[PDB]
């Protein structure tokens, strides 16, 4: 799979498990079309979102439902979600990593061949 998402919890020092992830692809009329989705695993990872044949160049948005995650832990969060928006560019594998705190997050792209 050319696109993987990994989420960590900076409060508990753990993978962020059961986080909902939605991927969108920008359409020609500038709307966001649903592309793929899932929930992070026990390791905080979401694999299998797409395939080399499907993941063509274009602008993609990855929406990480951080609010529901913090709500399930009983911790008041700031953001509605974390969104990562990027242009896929032709070999490359994309790992979108996110590090979550209730009032802060960071995201990093690890792009490898």
């Amino acid at each position: 799979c050319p696109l993987m998402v990994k989420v960590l919890d900076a409060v508990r020092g753990s993978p962020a498990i059961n986080v909902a992830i939605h991927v969108f692809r920008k359409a020609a009329d500038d709307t966001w079309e649903p592309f793929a989705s899932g929930k992070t695993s026990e390791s905080g990872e979401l694999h299998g979102l797409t395939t080399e044949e499907e993941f063509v160049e274009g602008i993609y948005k990855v929406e990480i439902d951080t609010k529901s995650y913090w709500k399930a832990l009983g911790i008041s969060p700031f953001h509605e979600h974390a969104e990562v928006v990027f242009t896929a560019n032709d070999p490359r594998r994309y790992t979108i990593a996110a590090l979550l705190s209730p009032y802060s997050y960071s995201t990093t792209a690890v792009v490898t061949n």
Copy 2:
């Protein structure tokens, strides 16, 4: 009530001349333009709104990081950094949205204080 501060993690400096657009979610669920501006030489953007106009709502702060890096000769990963949050739902607050930029990474933090 709403300030944006942007730092450059490659140079260890404010990120100057960064375009910032703020949107507010409308009743029909679309993003309406709310305010815009660009960071100063200190990397801050002040004066976007007022206590009266900054009512409860869901707000989106779009920071044009890609143009910033491209003007410095770098092709970055992200199209922009987007910060989406509910504001003032417990009464008016002061919000500082901070962003720390690298070509393939950014972080964003909110500092929320009660006037």
Copy 3:
């Protein structure tokens, strides 16, 4: 010439009353005490040193994050956050050391400006 700013990423607030110790590497390669203080209600620590006393050297800023979290009922991962850097080796500069704290994570950024 040297300021330290500390933010709490759990609460979205300045990190208040954080103890900070600064050390400078001596000629015998040991860490000598240089200055200390604690963050204010704004999460900043000003006045640690002066342009005259802040000579070239290798400096270490130790931020006592563990005591901060423990006083809030949290058992954090790190003993402290340590920021080590060469200062003023191209002439005097102004340094802001920023730290962003979570129980199992922190980040630190330097903003360096030329007077």
Copy 4:
């Protein structure tokens, strides 16, 4: 192995390869005794630093030679290194992750069972 170190490069969006890592354990006289060391792999990871039998409770310091890494890339860095200091506490595995930029770094502990 109970202790793993992973390093990412936020400028290139890649693992940080060939980064020197030194681990120290605090001695009874408060000095730092060398404990283990190595260099990150092509995946930015350093495995095999210690064993369950050796990695007893105590205070450990992980020193990541960020300066030499940035110098080899030709980019002027701020820090001499990144140090992560923590008390190991009894099952647990420790992953020390670091995200490097020339004037900033973050470190996170992912502690799992």
